[PDB]
Design a protein around this nucleic acid. Structure first.
Ligand SMILES: [K+]
Ligand SMILES: [K+]
Ligand SMILES: [Mg+2]
Ligand SMILES: [Mg+2]
Ligand SMILES: [Mg+2]
Ligand SMILES: [Mg+2]
Ligand SMILES: [Mg+2]
Ligand SMILES: [Mg+2]
Ligand SMILES: [Mg+2]
Ligand SMILES: [Mg+2]
Ligand SMILES: [Mg+2]
Ligand SMILES: [Mg+2]
Ligand SMILES: [Mg+2]
Ligand SMILES: [Mg+2]
Ligand SMILES: [Mg+2]
Ligand SMILES: [Mg+2]
Ligand SMILES: [Mg+2]
Ligand SMILES: [Mg+2]
Ligand SMILES: [Mg+2]
Ligand SMILES: [Mg+2]
Ligand SMILES: [Mg+2]
Ligand SMILES: [Mg+2]
Ligand SMILES: [Mg+2]
Ligand SMILES: [Mg+2]
Ligand SMILES: [Mg+2]
Ligand SMILES: [Mg+2]
Ligand SMILES: [Mg+2]
Ligand SMILES: [Mg+2]
Ligand SMILES: [Mg+2]
Ligand SMILES: [Mg+2]
Ligand SMILES: [Mg+2]
Ligand SMILES: [Mg+2]
Ligand SMILES: [Mg+2]
Ligand SMILES: [Mg+2]
Ligand SMILES: [Mg+2]
Ligand SMILES: [Mg+2]
Ligand SMILES: [Mg+2]
Ligand SMILES: [Mg+2]
Ligand SMILES: [Mg+2]
Ligand SMILES: [Mg+2]
Ligand SMILES: [Mg+2]
Ligand SMILES: [Mg+2]
Ligand SMILES: [Mg+2]
Ligand SMILES: [Mg+2]
Ligand SMILES: [Mg+2]
Ligand SMILES: [Mg+2]
Ligand SMILES: [Zn+2]
Lengths: 206, 60, 80, 24
RNA sequence: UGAAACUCAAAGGAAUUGACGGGGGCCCGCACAAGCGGUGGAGCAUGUGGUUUAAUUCGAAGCAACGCGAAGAACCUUACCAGGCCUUGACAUGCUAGGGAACCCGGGUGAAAGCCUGGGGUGCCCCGCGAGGGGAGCCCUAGCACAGGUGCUGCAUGGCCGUCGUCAGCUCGUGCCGUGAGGUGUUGGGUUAAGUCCCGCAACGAGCGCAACCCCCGCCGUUAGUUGCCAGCGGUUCGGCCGGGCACUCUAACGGGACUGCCCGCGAAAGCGGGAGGAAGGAGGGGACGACGUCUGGUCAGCAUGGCCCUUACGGCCUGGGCGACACACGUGCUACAAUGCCCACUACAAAGCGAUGCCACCCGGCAACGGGGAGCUAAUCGCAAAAAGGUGGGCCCAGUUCGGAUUGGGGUCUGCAACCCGACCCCAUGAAGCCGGAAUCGCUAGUAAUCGCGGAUCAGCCAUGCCGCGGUGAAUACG
């Protein structure tokens, strides 16, 4: 049990935060709990859309929530019905007149979180783990990327003996800082127990 | 974190003393920070996600 | 080196339940869970059953112990 | 020594004040 | 010369990759040696074993459990125990009604929790002249789906961590070799801290690791001056106080700097030894970072999770107790046994941090802890804050002593609903063991060890002498 989070390790450079707002020892804890509560309903809802990230900028009772997705349409709704309901669900949770931008992903095969989610799903749909992996690593490697790597936990195929499947291509230097490696973790509830997927995508350097 | 015990949030302490903190994320009572209302575990976790603004990996 | 300050604490539970039991003479037993309460003058002569955590113990309070706490007479643990 | 509360060091060590170490 | 009954699923041969010898060669690491300071003995703090207990909740178990989870057990926390109490429930979503309900307030009882209650009040819809009827919402009561479960399994799991070990090393692609497992490459010679680089080679390259990119410290520069200063000058309640100025010091963003580049010597190279200039010289010092994998390591008690098990109780609420027992044993520490010292004065010299119902200047009261009053700071600007070791003067004169501060008796102060069990602090009295510690054993290679004090997290308070950091003074030694 070694190696640090590839993101938390890269927050200085090649990686920015998911919440950009100053605060003092009197507010911080609150704007935080809330800021989380947001990702709460959001991730429990926008799941299908395939939410890869949720940035949150603040100014003063102003909330610049920016839901990133691959299918920006599931966000919107009929004409613009959802981005209306939810946008209202938010300001309901916290009376703070909240915005709610929406962005599409220029290739969801380069969104580590998604790739994880994808594979994590196939697992509950009872797919052959190794296949899924090799495939995923392929998709990612195909649509760009200088390297990629997927990891699944254990109890593969309901086995009593928990294992760990590999698979990876091209460079994936976790040790080099200026790597810019997106990373994503997807859970995987099951009839027999939990599994864990980890996605690594290496793109560019300096 | 027994749900029944996360009743701590219950202002009514009867005596201000009895009121104690708890992780706002895991319910963990044993090592909760004030400036985050988070225990050392949950704290380490979110900090890694980058969801704790300004908080970085300190080295020196 | 003991010390409280000013306000010799006493749970009124029994206080106003003893200072009253003085009016109609005395009585026979007063079981309490408040061993926190300080013993005081108008208790002398009485008999308080103090809960040690498993049982209530008979305590004939006397002059010589007017300043002590009630728990001091209801030992908590059982040893050898 | 640091264990003597009735001395300078005693107070300092215990980070307290009193006769043997008043606040200037 | 040479069987049988009975019995076994193997017995064997050669070769492969590993692991291992009290096999060999080569090499590294506070591994030994060299050296400086400890632990093991005492008293006490703290964790643990073991006993004890109504209960002393649970886990952690050689290294890699034992100041470990707990960066805060008086109630709370709390998961344990005794007792008094609840039952769709302290929390979610829902349903069928027998009905009245948003809410507000008082009492009876009681340890509290509860259980009884006694009332004050009727808005919201569509009806209806109205009386009043039917409905939303919310609250009750009666059954129901269901909640809840530190209840078991870490040998069903995720996640995270520890460990060998920052030790190098672990592999792939194609080619080549071999019937095959597999081998070659990655072996060899030189060299590195390094599978670092060089040279060679049936291999040519690549990936994960090394290294580098990130942070701190050391020299200098450029914007930038509510913190620096007679640096230079004018004022002086001689306080950088005022005017004044950014030079300096800083504060904090961005850059420059080192490349074995230069010279000499040795090499074939990579490099090695040495010399110059330089704040710094050959990874300048410290950190972040720990490969494929191993330990069926650790954690179901952070959380998540499959399966089992309890569902007027294995759920829930209180009041009290326990987690703080002790014949006894160990770990980690603290304070010491003194003169290179202890005490009382006087006086110097830090760095990091923290603070609006919180730091708390100053003043008065008190021996004091602390009370009362009160200025200032959203804090380079005010406070914590004294720096202590030092330096100067004075006392003690080798004694269990002016060493040491355990234990115990008093009298107080704080926090808190409340300090009996079970708080820290102050003052008087008491003044224990202890004269440098058996066998054995730990740390550290330099701003390190050893010494000295300071802050912070948790937190009302605190059982912190623990952790995590900060700066002062500053060694010894390494043949090998
Ligand atoms: K295992
Ligand atoms: K003694
Ligand atoms: Mg729970
Ligand atoms: Mg508390
Ligand atoms: Mg807490
Ligand atoms: Mg003394
Ligand atoms: Mg046989
Ligand atoms: Mg053989
Ligand atoms: Mg062999
Ligand atoms: Mg070495
Ligand atoms: Mg050693
Ligand atoms: Mg030695
Ligand atoms: Mg000892
Ligand atoms: Mg135990
Ligand atoms: Mg257990
Ligand atoms: Mg308790
Ligand atoms: Mg009553
Ligand atoms: Mg295990
Ligand atoms: Mg595990
Ligand atoms: Mg275990
Ligand atoms: Mg190394
Ligand atoms: Mg090959
Ligand atoms: Mg052969
Ligand atoms: Mg062949
Ligand atoms: Mg091969
Ligand atoms: Mg090899
Ligand atoms: Mg090989
Ligand atoms: Mg070989
Ligand atoms: Mg290499
Ligand atoms: Mg080598
Ligand atoms: Mg070669
Ligand atoms: Mg096990
Ligand atoms: Mg074990
Ligand atoms: Mg489970
Ligand atoms: Mg304990
Ligand atoms: Mg015993
Ligand atoms: Mg200690
Ligand atoms: Mg005075
Ligand atoms: Mg107490
Ligand atoms: Mg003696
Ligand atoms: Mg002597
Ligand atoms: Mg060393
Ligand atoms: Mg301290
Ligand atoms: Mg505190
Ligand atoms: Mg204590
Ligand atoms: Mg302390
Ligand atoms: Zn937490």
């Amino acid at each position: 049990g070694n190696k640090i989070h590839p993101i938390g390790f890269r927050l200085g450079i090649t990686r920015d935060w998911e919440s950009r707002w100053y605060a003092g020892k009197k507010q911080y804890r609150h704007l935080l709990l809330e800021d989380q509560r947001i990702r709460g309903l959001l991730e429990k809802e926008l799941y299908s859309a395939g939410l890869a990230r949720v940035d949150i900028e603040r100014a003063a009772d102003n909330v610049a929530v920016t839901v990133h997705v691959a299918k920006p349409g599931v966000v919107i709704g009929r004409g613009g019905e959802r981005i209306r309901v939810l946008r209202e669900e938010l300001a309901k949770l916290t009376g703070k007149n909240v915005a709610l931008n929406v962005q599409e992903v220029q290739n969801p095969n380069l969104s580590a979180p998604l790739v994880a989610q994808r594979v994590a799903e196939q697992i509950e749909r009872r797919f052959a783990v190794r296949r899924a992996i090799k495939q995923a690593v392929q998709r990612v490697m195909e649509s760009g990327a200088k390297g990629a790597k997927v990891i699944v936990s254990g109890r593969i195929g309901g086995a009593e003996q928990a294992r760990t499947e590999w698979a990876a291509q091209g460079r994936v230097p976790l040790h080099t800082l200026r790597a810019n490696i997106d990373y994503g973790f997807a859970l995987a509830r099951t009839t027999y127990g939990v599994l864990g997927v980890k996605a690594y995508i290496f793109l560019g350097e300096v | 974190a027994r749900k029944a015990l996360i009743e701590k949030a219950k202002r009514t302490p009867k005596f201000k003393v009895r009121a104690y903190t708890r992780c706002v994320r895991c319910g963990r009572a044993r090592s909760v920070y004030r400036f985050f209302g988070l225990c050392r575990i949950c704290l380490r976790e979110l900090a890694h996600k980058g969801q704790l603004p300004g908080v970085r990996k300190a080295s020196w | 080196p003991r010390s409280l300050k000013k306000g010799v604490f006493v749970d009124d539970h029994l206080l106003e339940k003893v200072l009253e039991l003085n009016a109609k003479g005395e009585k026979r037993l007063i079981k309490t869970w408040s061993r926190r309460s300080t013993i005081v003058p108008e208790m002398v002569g009485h008999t308080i059953a103090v809960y040690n955590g498993k049982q209530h113990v008979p305590v004939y309070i006397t002059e010589n112990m007017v300043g002590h706490k009630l728990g001091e007479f209801a030992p908590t643990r059982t040893y050898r | 020594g640091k264990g003597d509360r009735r001395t300078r060091r005693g107070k300092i060590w215990r980070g307290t004040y009193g006769k043997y170490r008043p606040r200037k």
